[PDB]
Structure formats: structure tokens, C-alpha cells
Amino acid sequence: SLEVTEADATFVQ
Amino acid sequence: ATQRFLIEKFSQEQIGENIVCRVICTTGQIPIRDLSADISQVLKEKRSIKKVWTFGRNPACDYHLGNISRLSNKHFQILLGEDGNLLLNDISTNGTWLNGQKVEKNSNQLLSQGDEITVGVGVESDILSLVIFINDKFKQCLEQNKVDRIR
Numbered sequence: 008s009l010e011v012t013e014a015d016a017t018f019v020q
Numbered sequence: 021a022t023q024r025f026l027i028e029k030f031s032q033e034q035i036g037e038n039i040v041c042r043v044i045c046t047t048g049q050i051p052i053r054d055l056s057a058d059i060s061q062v063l064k065e066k067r068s069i070k071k072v073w074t075f076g077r078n079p080a081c082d083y084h085l086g087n088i089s090r091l092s093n094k095h096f097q098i099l100l101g102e103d104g105n106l107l108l109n110d111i112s113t114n115g116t117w118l119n120g121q122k123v124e125k126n127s128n129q130l131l132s133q134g135d136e137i138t139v140g141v142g143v144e145s146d147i148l149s150l151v152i153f154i155n156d157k158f159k160q161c162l163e164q165n166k167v168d169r170i171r
Contacts, residue, residue, distance in 0.1 A: 012092035012113040015142045019115070 036157020040100045043075070043083060044151045046136065050085045057100050059158075063165055070101040074111070075150075088148055090114055090140035098152075099128065104162035106131035106154065117141055 028034075040057045043050075057071040075083030078093035085091060095112040107128040110116030116123055117138035123129055135152045 013089040014092075014113040017142075 036155050036161070039155040039158055040071070041098065041106055041131075041155065041158075042153035044153055045149070046151050047147075047149045049088075049148050050083075050150070053083055055082065055098065059161055062101065062162075065101075068101065069099050072097055072099040072109070076112070085148070088140050088146070090142060090146045091148065095139050096137060104159070104165065108135070108137065108152075110137075112139060114139070115141060117147075 038056045038058050039054060041055045042052065043055060044052045055073050062070045073082035074094045074097045075081055075085070076092055076094035076096065077085050077087060081094050085095070092111070092113040096116045097109040097111045099107045099109050101107075108116075108118075108123075108131065109128055110123055110125045112125070115125060118129070118132075119136055120138065122141070131154060132152075133154060135154075136149055137152065138147055138149045140147045
């Protein structure tokens, strides 16, 4: 379940 | 019966009692809130920082937003202290933006007049902006900080 904040994975562009 | 004061309150309530900065959403998503700090505590507290605000989808956060999956519980944080200025600290999982320019997370930045912070970047349809309103009165008091007080 959890609730990890949806964060992109584009090597922090 | 608070009728007269009500007139002055709506037209222009007395702001600056201990008001640091105000957060206003321009994208129309989160309700306006008022950030504040005690002047006596700021002057008396000769430490690194005085009071800091945390903003995000967290009910703990000094600022509670609506519900953006792109934003984190505590998307961003604002710190007040140093001497007579303000600093903005980003703390989002996705990042915090300033007028379109992304800043370094958990990093301190110099306050700006009517500054604005953008969050939830990645999807043009998933970004939220916020405007910061600095209290002129606060700046005036901070300028004098400790009154000489002529004995």
C-alpha cells in the first residue's frame, strides 16, 4: 500500500 | 458591536502584528494562509533560525494543500531568522520551483518580493504555483529590531 510521493525518475533533469 | 472595526478590517485589517509572510495560491487549488513569527522571540533568540514553515499535503505541515500526488507531504519549507530577512527551503520529493527556475532542494534561498514557488513539475497538467506575500510592517520592525529606548 504505502503512500510514496509520486516522483519522476528522469535523473533529476 | 464590531461594526465599525469590521469596516476597517475588510478594507484593510491591521497586518504586521507578528506576520512574517503570506502564502497565496495563484493556480486556485489551496486556500490562502498566514505565516507568522513572534518578534520578541526572534530578537531574544540569537540562534541560527527562529521559526520555519513546512508546506505540503501533510496535515502536520504548517501549510495543508489539497491533494496532489506529484507533491510530497512536506513539499517545501520556509525559514525565518538570520537577521532581518527571509529564506525559502525546498523539501519536495519532486522538487521546488521559483518562477520557472528549479532550486536546490533543502537549500536556503534569499526571499523575494511577491515571490512565487511552483511545484509538481513533470507534467504541464500537474504543476501547482504559489505566491508569497511579505509583510512590509514586519520588515520595518525587523529593521529597528531592538529599540534604543531613551531612558
